[PDB]
Amino acid sequence: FLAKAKEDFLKKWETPSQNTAQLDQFDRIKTLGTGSFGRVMLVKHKESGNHYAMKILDKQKVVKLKQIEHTLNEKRILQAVNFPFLVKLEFSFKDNSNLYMVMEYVAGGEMFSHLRRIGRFSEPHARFYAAQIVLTFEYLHSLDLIYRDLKPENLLIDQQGYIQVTDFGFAKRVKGRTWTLCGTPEYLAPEIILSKGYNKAVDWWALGVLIYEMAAGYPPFFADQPIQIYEKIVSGKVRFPSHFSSDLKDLLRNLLQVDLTKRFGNLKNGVNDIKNHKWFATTDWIAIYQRKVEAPFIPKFYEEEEIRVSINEKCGKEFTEF
Numbered sequence: 001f002l003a004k005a006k007e008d009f010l011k012k013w014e015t016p017s018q019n020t021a022q023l024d025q026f027d028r029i030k031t032l033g034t035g036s037f038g039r040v041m042l043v044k045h046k047e048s049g050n051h052y053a054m055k056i057l058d059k060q061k062v063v064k065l066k067q068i069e070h071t072l073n074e075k076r077i078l079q080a081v082n083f084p085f086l087v088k089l090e091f092s093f094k095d096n097s098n099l100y101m102v103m104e105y106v107a108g109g110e111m112f113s114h115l116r117r118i119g120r121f122s123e124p125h126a127r128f129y130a131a132q133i134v135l136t137f138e139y140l141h142s143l144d145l146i147y148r149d150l151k152p153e154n155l156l157i158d159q160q161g162y163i164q165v166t167d168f169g170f171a172k173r174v175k176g177r178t179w180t181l182c183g184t185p186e187y188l189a190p191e192i193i194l195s196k197g198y199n200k201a202v203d204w205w206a207l208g209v210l211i212y213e214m215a216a217g218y219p220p221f222f223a224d225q226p227i228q229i230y231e232k233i234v235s236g237k238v239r240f241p242s243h244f245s246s247d248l249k250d251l252l253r254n255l256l257q258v259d260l261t262k263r264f265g266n267l268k269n270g271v272n273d274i275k276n277h278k279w280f281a282t283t284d285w286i287a288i289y290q291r292k293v294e295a296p297f298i299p300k301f302y303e304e305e306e307i308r309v310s311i312n313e314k315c316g317k318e319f320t321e322f
């Protein structure tokens with residue numbers, strides 16, 4: 001009976017929450033780091049006492065870098081969704097100068113830098129992470145959301161060693177097909193490259209690419225020039241390292257299926273063809289969803305400038321919906 005997850009997403013999708021907090025409600029502790037459009041600040045919600053990561057997006061910068069649609073889309077998705085492996089948007093508001101995304105404070109690590117530092121993951125460790133992505137894509141797809149941007153860079157490891165998807169700029173809600181050429185070359189599904197339309201099956205392609213990259217330490221398709229990567233994706237084969245189990249190679253043959261009508265995740269049994277695959281025979285799907293499996297990696301956990309908000313409104317039109 002999770003037609004309630006759909007019903008609730010749809011209320012929030014149809015009437016997105018706006019100005020759910022304001023700046024004067026947060027104590028500013030310190031700057032955590034710098035983003036594309038401004039700082040992320042550790043803040044204490046004055047009422048509750050909880051700490052959050054407040055991302056400050058300068059509207060003028062977002063316009064200048066032509067990231068308007070992506071910013072709006074990301075916020076709109078994040079205020080509608082609810083799933084254990086999606087970063088939690090706690091509050092959003094705007095003022096004359098900035099957009100504010102008040103995120104759950106997650107003192108974790110980055111999948112990208114953990115993968116690159118370790119070199120590669122064991123199949124059982126790759127499988128632990130992959131199962132979180134499988135359940136996430138099941139959720140997103142049941143809401144007609146195509147993520148279409150999977151890659152380690154988009155995944156952080158929280159304090160329990162579980163995944164959170166951190167970026168929804170590219171994700172599109174759409175019932176059938178869409179055409180936008182977007183993503184990063186190594187993770188492009190062939191039906192995206194061939195420019196005749198694609199659907200949610202491109203996420204299962206990208207899962208294949210991620211599992212391979214986790215298990216090998218490098219992705220299946222790579223080259224000095226993007227056109228060489230596109231050639232490989234479209235009409236190349238894949239080469240599995242000899243260390244890959246036959247279970248893993250069989251799963252990847254069916255995820256990195258160049259023909260989307262035969263790709264696992266896109267057939268009559270849908271997500272069950274992936275969940276019921278041999279490689280995932282040891283995965284307790286319910287237990288992964290409940291974060292009851294012990295994770296293999298637990299992350300370890302002066303120059304302060306004020307925020308100036310203009311008295312004049314900037315980019316009112318561009319960010320009306322926010």
Ligand SMILES: Nc1ncnc2c1ncn2[C@@H]1O[C@H](COP(=O)(O)OP(=O)(O)NP(=O)(O)O)[C@@H](O)[C@H]1O
Pocket residue numbers: 032033034035036037040053103104105106107
């Ligand atoms: N939820 C969070 N919890 C804790 N620290 C965070 C959180 N979100 C962002 N940060 C910190 O803020 C820094 C910059 O924000 P970040 O979200 O990385 O920016 P971005 O604009 O999304 N670009 P990118 O660095 O490529 O992801 C990060 O390197 C973290 O140190």
Ligand SMILES: [Cl-]
Pocket residue numbers: 181182183184185
């Ligand atoms: Cl591209």
